Amino acid sequence: MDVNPTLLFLKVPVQNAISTTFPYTGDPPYSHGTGTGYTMDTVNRTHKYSEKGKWTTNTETGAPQLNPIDGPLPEDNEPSGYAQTDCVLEAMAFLEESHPGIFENSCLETMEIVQQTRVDKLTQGRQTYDWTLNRNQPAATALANTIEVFRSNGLTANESGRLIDFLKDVMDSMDKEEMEITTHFQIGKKKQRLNKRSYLIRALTLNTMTKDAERGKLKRRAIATPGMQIRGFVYFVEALARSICEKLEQSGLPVGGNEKKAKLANVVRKMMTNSQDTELSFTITGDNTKWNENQNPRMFLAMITYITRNQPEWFRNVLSIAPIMFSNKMARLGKGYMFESKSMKLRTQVPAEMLANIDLKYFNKSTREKIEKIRPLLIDGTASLSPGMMMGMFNMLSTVLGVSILNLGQKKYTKTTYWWDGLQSSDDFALIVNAPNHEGIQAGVDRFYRTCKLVGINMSKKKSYINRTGTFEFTSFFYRYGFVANFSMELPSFGVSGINESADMSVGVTVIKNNMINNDLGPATAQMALQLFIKDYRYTYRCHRGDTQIQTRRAFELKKLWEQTRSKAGLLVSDGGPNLYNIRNLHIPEVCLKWELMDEDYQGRLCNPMNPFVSNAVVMPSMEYDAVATTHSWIPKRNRSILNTSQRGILEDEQMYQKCCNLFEKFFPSSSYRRPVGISSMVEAMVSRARIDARIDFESGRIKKEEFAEIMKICSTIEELRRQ
Amino acid sequence: IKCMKTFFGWKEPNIIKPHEKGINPNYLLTWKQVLAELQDIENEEKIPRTK
RNA sequence: AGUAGUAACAAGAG
RNA sequence: ACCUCUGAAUAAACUAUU
RNA sequence: AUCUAUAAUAGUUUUUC
Ligand SMILES: [Mg+2]
């Protein structure tokens, strides 16, 4: 008998065994070399989707720009970016007419957000494309470099600390004739002076790379990293789009998890109830083909212009900057290529900046065609990409556009016997169509498809299907008269997370508990998951039981600790103790779970604030998944690859930054608890605080006049040093 | 080493199905080197964690 | 050779 | 050639925990 | 009855010929 696991679906409905279709136990696919090929493919495809548009040369950067707006109406079902501006404006108008006041109230909330947001909002995130180095940097590091460069060039409006003032500084930098930077090499500092067009090309540039560890995709794809100049504008536009989306029932963003599932189920059931019993109902499990390569920044500018009608001019300008910068964007080509000589047995890296005027004999046929197609667009080492939204940006504004198209499906707008509605999340959608008969269903689907074509939305025919309402798929959630559990999606979360011993134990037990609550993880499987996690935890951290003879480097110390302990159950698993977790106590931290079983001296050593592994007191170092800090809350080593580069002065600079920050925290105790705000310098703020505190201590008699005078003398000395 | 000692019948190794793209005598030499170094670690009266 | 798959590793840098 | 260093951080939303 | 704290970390979701 040949074993056929797929035959299980003959009796178990596919949604009820959907976990079997996710092979998430093996390693995900990765990208090995460069991303230049994928980036060039994306640029060529984006320009191909708009090839019948109008070509212009940008007067400020010189980049050729393709404009598909108001292009010819398509005659086939191929993807295209020929969105009609009047159709988009009419969709926005009807969305506003069906939900009166949505844009006005969203604009009020966004005005409050714009006026109140601080500059350090930009540090939230992993990487930002640093134009001063032509590569990705940590968001805080990129922001610090940009601020230092702006200060050296007399652009100091960001000293207010507000994000909008930083955006004003960006706008002012756009008008500087020359921007100066500083470069390091093999470690001295050199000044480089960009010109206006060079800086403008750098500021409009988004970095590109490949996406690693992506599930369900046979082929790799390119992704983007926004630069420092555009991040604030994108944040403000997305804040407005979020305010709009919060007021829309069809929106799939920004609600996630159980709240999202409940909202979607309620919306679907409301649609079912509003449907007459004497009419057919069909749901479309729909995807869109190349949503971000067909949507145009000019249409987003039009949407923002319609949304911000009757608003103050400054608000309209600050919202409009982002689509304007996105319609003049450049794309970094990437690493380039590597060339291999078989006879001479050598390999070499070809930078992407040489692809403008490199001989085409080296490349193969497909890459040569890519380079030939993209060479007219190449400028200053980047590619001109006017059409398209690059990658994972303006998702909620895309949701707004999709919801407007869905909203166009009321009977007041269709003006016929059919109507539609559904769900929208960025580009993914689900559509419910009602009609007296099948002809009406076909007509409604056709009208939805053609309206989407008008606004530049192409429904992926090969990835969409339609059936009677009751089952659909939306944003990887499988609905079979209700959302079903999908355990395989959370399966990679089980295991040793890799923070430290205490945090990893907490993560393991919390993941088991959360999957019991949410993903229908049964009690027996929860116990087995706990056993497997304990096994992996003991193997990973070399913390097997003391009464075992697993030969590790740590086994002798654990044996010694086990021998001298009286109450073995009190030892943590990190110390070789037993596992006391079961279903009933998954929610309890380990140190608290076995606190009363510990020896007094072992407990005193474990929870000793004067231990070197963690920076009547308690152990404190950012204590995620670590309720009680012990000696097991240590911090692993950082990567040392930067010591071989020219950026190794950043280590000394950050050491001095940490020193100054800790000294400041010595003056403002609440600084760590809540982020301090202020335009004054650190030394000035500290001196003022010291003076007021010394005066108060003298007044209340906590210190004597001699100490007050000494503090005043030291403050005067610091003031003297401050100027010089 | 103990598992190897539990088997009697070790003949002189010879190639049965060769690797068509590789150098099979290198594989034979690799196996013989493995046997030789197993004997070496067996004869050093202190078996280490790694070889 | 092998891994692997639209580009790489099969050490790199000083 | 010895020697020395090093083992590699997309976006957005969400979820979990602190 | 209502109910997006702030921040940090990790995880999850988001494909043309
Ligand atoms: Mg979908």
Coordinates of N, CA, C and O in Angstrom, one line a residue, chain A residues 385-514:
Chain A
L385 N 13.2 55.4 -11.6 CA 12.0 54.6 -11.4 C 10.8 55.6 -11.0 O 10.5 55.7 -9.8
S386 N 10.2 56.2 -12.0 CA 9.1 57.1 -11.7 C 7.8 56.3 -11.4 O 7.2 56.6 -10.3
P387 N 7.4 55.4 -12.2 CA 6.1 54.7 -11.9 C 6.4 53.7 -10.8 O 7.5 53.2 -10.5
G388 N 5.3 53.3 -10.1 CA 5.3 52.3 -9.1 C 5.6 52.7 -7.7 O 6.2 53.7 -7.5
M389 N 5.1 52.0 -6.7 CA 5.5 52.1 -5.4 C 6.4 50.9 -5.1 O 6.1 49.8 -5.4
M390 N 7.6 51.2 -4.6 CA 8.7 50.2 -4.7 C 8.4 48.9 -4.0 O 8.1 47.9 -4.7
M391 N 8.4 48.9 -2.7 CA 8.3 47.6 -1.9 C 7.8 47.9 -0.5 O 8.5 48.6 0.2
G392 N 6.6 47.4 -0.2 CA 6.2 47.5 1.2 C 6.1 48.9 1.8 O 6.4 49.1 2.9
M393 N 5.6 49.9 1.0 CA 5.4 51.2 1.4 C 4.0 51.7 1.0 O 3.5 51.3 0.0
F394 N 3.5 52.6 1.8 CA 2.1 53.1 1.5 C 1.1 52.0 1.5 O 0.2 52.1 0.6
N395 N 1.2 51.0 2.4 CA 0.3 49.9 2.4 C -1.1 50.4 2.7 O -2.1 49.9 2.2
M396 N -1.3 51.3 3.7 CA -2.6 51.7 4.2 C -3.2 52.6 3.2 O -4.5 52.6 3.1
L397 N -2.5 53.4 2.5 CA -3.1 54.3 1.4 C -3.6 53.4 0.3 O -4.6 53.6 -0.3
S398 N -2.8 52.3 0.0 CA -3.3 51.3 -1.0 C -4.6 50.7 -0.5 O -5.5 50.4 -1.3
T399 N -4.7 50.4 0.8 CA -5.9 49.9 1.4 C -7.1 50.9 1.2 O -8.2 50.5 0.9
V400 N -6.8 52.2 1.4 CA -7.8 53.2 1.2 C -8.3 53.1 -0.2 O -9.5 53.2 -0.5
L401 N -7.4 53.1 -1.2 CA -7.8 53.0 -2.6 C -8.7 51.7 -2.9 O -9.7 51.8 -3.5
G402 N -8.2 50.6 -2.4 CA -9.0 49.4 -2.6 C -10.4 49.4 -1.9 O -11.4 48.9 -2.5
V403 N -10.5 50.0 -0.7 CA -11.7 50.2 0.0 C -12.7 51.1 -0.8 O -13.9 50.9 -0.8
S404 N -12.1 52.2 -1.4 CA -12.9 53.0 -2.2 C -13.5 52.3 -3.4 O -14.7 52.4 -3.8
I405 N -12.7 51.4 -4.1 CA -13.2 50.6 -5.2 C -14.3 49.6 -4.7 O -15.3 49.4 -5.3
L406 N -14.1 49.0 -3.5 CA -15.1 48.2 -2.9 C -16.4 49.0 -2.6 O -17.5 48.5 -2.9
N407 N -16.3 50.2 -2.0 CA -17.4 51.1 -1.7 C -18.2 51.5 -3.0 O -19.4 51.8 -2.8
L408 N -17.5 51.5 -4.1 CA -18.2 51.8 -5.4 C -19.3 50.7 -5.7 O -19.9 50.9 -6.7
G409 N -19.4 49.7 -4.9 CA -20.3 48.6 -5.2 C -21.6 48.6 -4.6 O -22.3 47.6 -4.6
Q410 N -22.0 49.7 -4.0 CA -23.4 49.8 -3.4 C -24.4 49.9 -4.6 O -24.0 50.3 -5.7
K411 N -25.6 49.6 -4.3 CA -26.7 49.7 -5.3 C -26.9 51.1 -5.7 O -27.3 51.3 -6.9
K412 N -26.6 52.1 -4.9 CA -26.7 53.5 -5.3 C -25.7 53.8 -6.4 O -25.9 54.8 -7.1
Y413 N -24.6 53.1 -6.5 CA -23.6 53.4 -7.4 C -23.7 52.4 -8.6 O -23.5 52.9 -9.8
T414 N -23.9 51.1 -8.4 CA -24.0 50.2 -9.5 C -25.3 50.5 -10.3 O -25.3 50.3 -11.5
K415 N -26.3 51.0 -9.6 CA -27.6 51.4 -10.3 C -28.2 50.2 -11.1 O -28.7 50.4 -12.2
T416 N -28.1 49.0 -10.5 CA -28.6 47.8 -11.2 C -29.0 46.8 -10.1 O -29.1 47.2 -8.9
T417 N -29.3 45.6 -10.5 CA -29.8 44.6 -9.6 C -28.7 43.8 -8.9 O -29.0 43.0 -8.0
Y418 N -27.4 44.1 -9.2 CA -26.3 43.5 -8.5 C -25.5 44.6 -7.6 O -25.6 45.8 -7.9
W419 N -24.8 44.1 -6.6 CA -24.0 45.0 -5.8 C -22.9 44.1 -5.2 O -23.0 42.9 -5.1
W420 N -21.8 44.8 -4.7 CA -20.7 44.1 -4.2 C -20.2 44.8 -3.0 O -20.4 46.0 -2.8
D421 N -19.4 44.1 -2.2 CA -18.7 44.6 -1.0 C -17.6 43.5 -0.7 O -17.7 42.4 -1.2
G422 N -16.7 43.9 0.3 CA -15.8 42.9 0.7 C -14.7 43.5 1.6 O -15.0 44.5 2.3
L423 N -13.6 42.8 1.6 CA -12.5 43.1 2.5 C -11.3 43.6 1.7 O -11.0 43.1 0.6
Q424 N -10.5 44.5 2.3 CA -9.3 45.0 1.7 C -8.2 45.2 2.7 O -8.4 45.8 3.8
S425 N -7.0 44.6 2.3 CA -5.8 44.8 3.2 C -4.6 45.0 2.2 O -4.2 44.0 1.6
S426 N -4.1 46.2 2.2 CA -3.1 46.6 1.2 C -3.5 46.3 -0.2 O -4.3 47.0 -0.8
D427 N -3.0 45.2 -0.7 CA -3.4 44.7 -2.1 C -4.3 43.5 -2.1 O -5.0 43.3 -3.1
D428 N -4.3 42.7 -1.0 CA -5.1 41.5 -1.0 C -6.6 42.0 -0.7 O -6.8 43.0 -0.1
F429 N -7.5 41.2 -1.3 CA -8.9 41.6 -1.1 C -9.8 40.3 -1.2 O -9.3 39.3 -1.7
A430 N -11.0 40.4 -0.6 CA -12.0 39.5 -0.9 C -13.3 40.2 -1.2 O -13.5 41.3 -0.7
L431 N -14.1 39.7 -2.2 CA -15.2 40.4 -2.7 C -16.4 39.5 -2.6 O -16.4 38.3 -3.0
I432 N -17.5 40.1 -2.2 CA -18.8 39.4 -2.1 C -19.8 40.1 -3.1 O -19.9 41.3 -3.0
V433 N -20.4 39.3 -4.0 CA -21.2 39.8 -5.0 C -22.6 39.2 -4.9 O -22.7 38.0 -4.7
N434 N -23.6 40.0 -4.9 CA -25.0 39.6 -4.8 C -25.8 40.0 -6.1 O -25.6 41.1 -6.6
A435 N -26.6 39.1 -6.5 CA -27.4 39.3 -7.7 C -28.6 38.4 -7.8 O -28.5 37.3 -7.1
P436 N -29.7 38.7 -8.5 CA -30.8 37.8 -8.6 C -30.4 36.5 -9.3 O -31.0 35.4 -9.0
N437 N -29.5 36.5 -10.2 CA -29.1 35.2 -10.9 C -27.6 35.3 -11.3 O -26.9 36.2 -10.9
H438 N -27.2 34.2 -12.0 CA -25.8 34.1 -12.3 C -25.3 35.1 -13.3 O -24.2 35.6 -13.3
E439 N -26.2 35.6 -14.2 CA -25.9 36.6 -15.1 C -25.5 37.9 -14.4 O -24.6 38.6 -14.7
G440 N -26.3 38.2 -13.4 CA -26.0 39.4 -12.5 C -24.7 39.2 -11.8 O -23.9 40.2 -11.7
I441 N -24.3 38.0 -11.4 CA -23.1 37.8 -10.7 C -21.9 38.1 -11.7 O -20.9 38.7 -11.3
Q442 N -22.1 37.5 -12.9 CA -21.0 37.8 -13.9 C -20.9 39.2 -14.2 O -19.8 39.8 -14.3
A443 N -22.0 39.9 -14.4 CA -22.0 41.4 -14.7 C -21.3 42.2 -13.5 O -20.5 43.1 -13.8
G444 N -21.6 41.8 -12.3 CA -21.0 42.5 -11.2 C -19.5 42.3 -11.1 O -18.8 43.2 -10.8
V445 N -19.1 41.0 -11.3 CA -17.7 40.7 -11.3 C -17.0 41.5 -12.4 O -15.9 42.1 -12.2
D446 N -17.6 41.5 -13.6 CA -17.0 42.3 -14.7 C -16.9 43.7 -14.4 O -15.9 44.4 -14.7
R447 N -17.9 44.3 -13.8 CA -17.9 45.7 -13.5 C -16.8 46.1 -12.5 O -16.1 47.1 -12.6
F448 N -16.7 45.2 -11.5 CA -15.6 45.4 -10.5 C -14.3 45.3 -11.1 O -13.4 46.2 -10.9
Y449 N -14.1 44.3 -12.0 CA -12.8 44.2 -12.7 C -12.5 45.4 -13.5 O -11.3 45.9 -13.5
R450 N -13.4 45.9 -14.3 CA -13.2 47.0 -15.2 C -13.0 48.3 -14.4 O -12.2 49.1 -14.8
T451 N -13.7 48.5 -13.3 CA -13.5 49.7 -12.5 C -12.0 49.6 -11.9 O -11.3 50.6 -11.8
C452 N -11.6 48.4 -11.4 CA -10.3 48.3 -10.9 C -9.2 48.6 -12.0 O -8.2 49.3 -11.7
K453 N -9.5 48.2 -13.2 CA -8.6 48.5 -14.3 C -8.6 50.0 -14.5 O -7.5 50.6 -14.8
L454 N -9.7 50.7 -14.4 CA -9.8 52.1 -14.5 C -8.9 52.8 -13.5 O -8.2 53.8 -13.8
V455 N -8.9 52.3 -12.3 CA -8.1 53.0 -11.3 C -6.7 52.4 -11.2 O -5.9 52.7 -10.3
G456 N -6.4 51.5 -12.2 CA -5.0 51.0 -12.3 C -4.8 49.7 -11.4 O -3.7 49.5 -11.0
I457 N -5.9 49.0 -11.1 CA -5.8 47.8 -10.2 C -6.1 46.6 -11.1 O -7.1 46.5 -11.8
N458 N -5.1 45.7 -11.2 CA -5.2 44.5 -12.0 C -5.5 43.3 -11.2 O -4.6 42.9 -10.4
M459 N -6.7 42.7 -11.3 CA -7.0 41.5 -10.6 C -6.3 40.3 -11.2 O -6.5 39.9 -12.4
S460 N -5.5 39.6 -10.4 CA -4.8 38.4 -10.9 C -5.8 37.3 -11.2 O -6.4 36.7 -10.3
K461 N -6.0 37.0 -12.5 CA -6.9 36.0 -12.9 C -6.4 34.6 -12.5 O -7.2 33.7 -12.0
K462 N -5.1 34.4 -12.6 CA -4.6 33.0 -12.3 C -4.4 32.7 -10.8 O -4.2 31.6 -10.5
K463 N -4.6 33.7 -10.0 CA -4.5 33.5 -8.5 C -5.9 33.8 -7.8 O -5.9 33.9 -6.6
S464 N -7.0 34.0 -8.6 CA -8.2 34.3 -8.0 C -9.3 33.3 -8.4 O -9.2 32.7 -9.5
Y465 N -10.3 33.0 -7.6 CA -11.4 32.1 -7.9 C -12.6 32.6 -7.2 O -12.5 33.5 -6.3
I466 N -13.8 32.1 -7.5 CA -15.0 32.5 -7.0 C -15.9 31.3 -6.7 O -15.9 30.3 -7.4
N467 N -16.7 31.3 -5.6 CA -17.6 30.3 -5.2 C -18.7 30.9 -4.4 O -18.7 32.1 -4.1
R468 N -19.7 30.0 -4.0 CA -20.7 30.5 -3.2 C -20.2 31.0 -1.9 O -19.2 30.5 -1.3
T469 N -20.8 32.1 -1.3 CA -20.3 32.7 -0.1 C -20.4 31.8 1.0 O -21.4 31.0 1.2
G470 N -19.4 31.8 1.9 CA -19.3 30.9 3.0 C -17.9 30.4 3.3 O -17.5 30.1 4.4
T471 N -17.0 30.3 2.2 CA -15.6 30.0 2.4 C -14.8 30.9 1.5 O -15.1 31.1 0.3
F472 N -13.7 31.4 2.1 CA -12.8 32.3 1.3 C -11.5 32.3 2.1 O -11.3 31.8 3.2
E473 N -10.5 32.9 1.4 CA -9.2 33.1 2.0 C -8.8 34.6 1.9 O -9.0 35.2 0.9
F474 N -8.2 35.1 3.0 CA -7.9 36.5 3.0 C -6.7 36.8 3.9 O -6.8 36.5 5.1
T475 N -5.6 37.3 3.4 CA -4.4 37.6 4.1 C -4.0 36.3 4.9 O -3.7 36.4 6.1
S476 N -3.9 35.2 4.2 CA -3.5 33.9 4.7 C -4.4 33.4 5.8 O -4.0 32.4 6.5
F477 N -5.5 34.0 6.1 CA -6.5 33.4 7.0 C -7.6 32.6 6.2 O -8.1 33.1 5.2
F478 N -7.8 31.4 6.6 CA -8.7 30.5 5.9 C -10.0 30.5 6.6 O -10.1 30.1 7.7
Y479 N -11.1 30.9 5.9 CA -12.4 31.0 6.4 C -13.3 29.9 5.9 O -13.5 29.8 4.7
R480 N -13.8 29.0 6.8 CA -14.8 28.0 6.4 C -15.9 28.2 7.3 O -16.0 27.5 8.4
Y481 N -16.9 29.1 7.0 CA -18.0 29.5 7.8 C -17.5 30.1 9.1 O -18.2 30.1 10.1
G482 N -16.2 30.6 9.1 CA -15.5 31.0 10.3 C -14.1 30.7 10.1 O -13.7 29.8 9.4
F483 N -13.2 31.5 10.8 CA -11.8 31.3 10.6 C -11.3 30.1 11.3 O -11.6 29.8 12.5
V484 N -10.5 29.3 10.7 CA -10.0 28.0 11.2 C -8.6 28.2 11.8 O -7.9 29.2 11.5
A485 N -8.2 27.3 12.6 CA -6.9 27.3 13.2 C -5.8 26.9 12.2 O -6.1 26.1 11.3
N486 N -4.6 27.6 12.3 CA -3.5 27.2 11.4 C -2.3 27.2 12.3 O -1.6 28.2 12.6
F487 N -2.0 25.9 12.8 CA -0.9 25.8 13.7 C 0.5 25.9 13.0 O 1.5 26.4 13.7
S488 N 0.6 25.5 11.8 CA 1.9 25.5 11.1 C 2.5 26.9 11.0 O 3.7 27.0 10.8
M489 N 1.7 27.9 11.0 CA 2.2 29.3 10.8 C 3.0 29.7 12.1 O 4.0 30.4 11.9
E490 N 2.6 29.2 13.2 CA 3.3 29.6 14.5 C 4.3 28.5 14.9 O 5.0 28.7 15.9
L491 N 4.4 27.4 14.1 CA 5.4 26.4 14.4 C 6.8 26.8 14.5 O 7.5 26.4 15.4
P492 N 7.3 27.7 13.6 CA 8.7 28.1 13.7 C 9.0 29.0 15.0 O 10.1 29.1 15.4
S493 N 7.9 29.5 15.6 CA 8.2 30.3 16.9 C 8.6 29.4 18.0 O 9.3 29.8 18.9
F494 N 8.2 28.1 18.0 CA 8.6 27.2 19.1 C 10.1 26.9 18.9 O 10.6 26.7 17.8
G495 N 10.8 26.9 20.1 CA 12.2 26.7 20.1 C 12.9 27.7 20.9 O 12.3 28.6 21.5
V496 N 14.2 27.6 20.9 CA 15.1 28.5 21.7 C 15.2 29.8 20.9 O 15.8 29.8 19.8
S497 N 14.7 30.9 21.4 CA 14.7 32.2 20.7 C 16.0 32.8 20.6 O 16.3 33.5 19.6
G498 N 16.9 32.7 21.6 CA 18.2 33.2 21.5 C 18.4 34.6 22.1 O 19.1 35.4 21.5
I499 N 17.8 34.8 23.3 CA 18.1 36.1 24.0 C 19.1 35.8 25.1 O 20.2 36.4 25.1
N500 N 18.6 35.0 26.0 CA 19.5 34.4 27.1 C 18.7 33.3 27.7 O 17.6 32.9 27.2
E501 N 19.2 32.7 28.8 CA 18.6 31.5 29.4 C 17.2 31.8 29.9 O 16.2 31.1 29.6
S502 N 17.1 32.8 30.8 CA 15.8 33.2 31.4 C 14.8 33.6 30.3 O 13.6 33.1 30.4
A503 N 15.1 34.5 29.4 CA 14.2 34.9 28.4 C 13.8 33.8 27.5 O 12.6 33.7 27.1
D504 N 14.7 32.9 27.2 CA 14.3 31.8 26.3 C 13.3 30.8 27.0 O 12.4 30.3 26.4
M505 N 13.5 30.6 28.3 CA 12.6 29.7 29.0 C 11.2 30.4 29.0 O 10.2 29.7 28.7
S506 N 11.2 31.7 29.3 CA 9.9 32.4 29.3 C 9.2 32.4 28.0 O 8.0 32.2 27.9
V507 N 10.0 32.6 26.9 CA 9.4 32.6 25.6 C 8.9 31.2 25.2 O 7.8 31.1 24.7
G508 N 9.6 30.1 25.6 CA 9.0 28.8 25.3 C 7.7 28.5 25.9 O 6.7 28.1 25.3
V509 N 7.6 28.8 27.3 CA 6.4 28.5 27.9 C 5.3 29.4 27.5 O 4.1 29.0 27.3
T510 N 5.6 30.7 27.2 CA 4.6 31.7 26.8 C 4.0 31.3 25.4 O 2.9 31.5 25.1
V511 N 4.9 30.8 24.5 CA 4.5 30.4 23.2 C 3.6 29.2 23.3 O 2.5 29.2 22.6
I512 N 3.9 28.3 24.1 CA 3.0 27.1 24.3 C 1.6 27.6 24.8 O 0.6 27.1 24.3
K513 N 1.6 28.5 25.8 CA 0.3 29.0 26.3 C -0.5 29.7 25.2 O -1.7 29.5 25.1
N514 N 0.2 30.6 24.5 CA -0.5 31.4 23.5 C -1.1 30.5 22.4 O -2.2 30.7 21.9

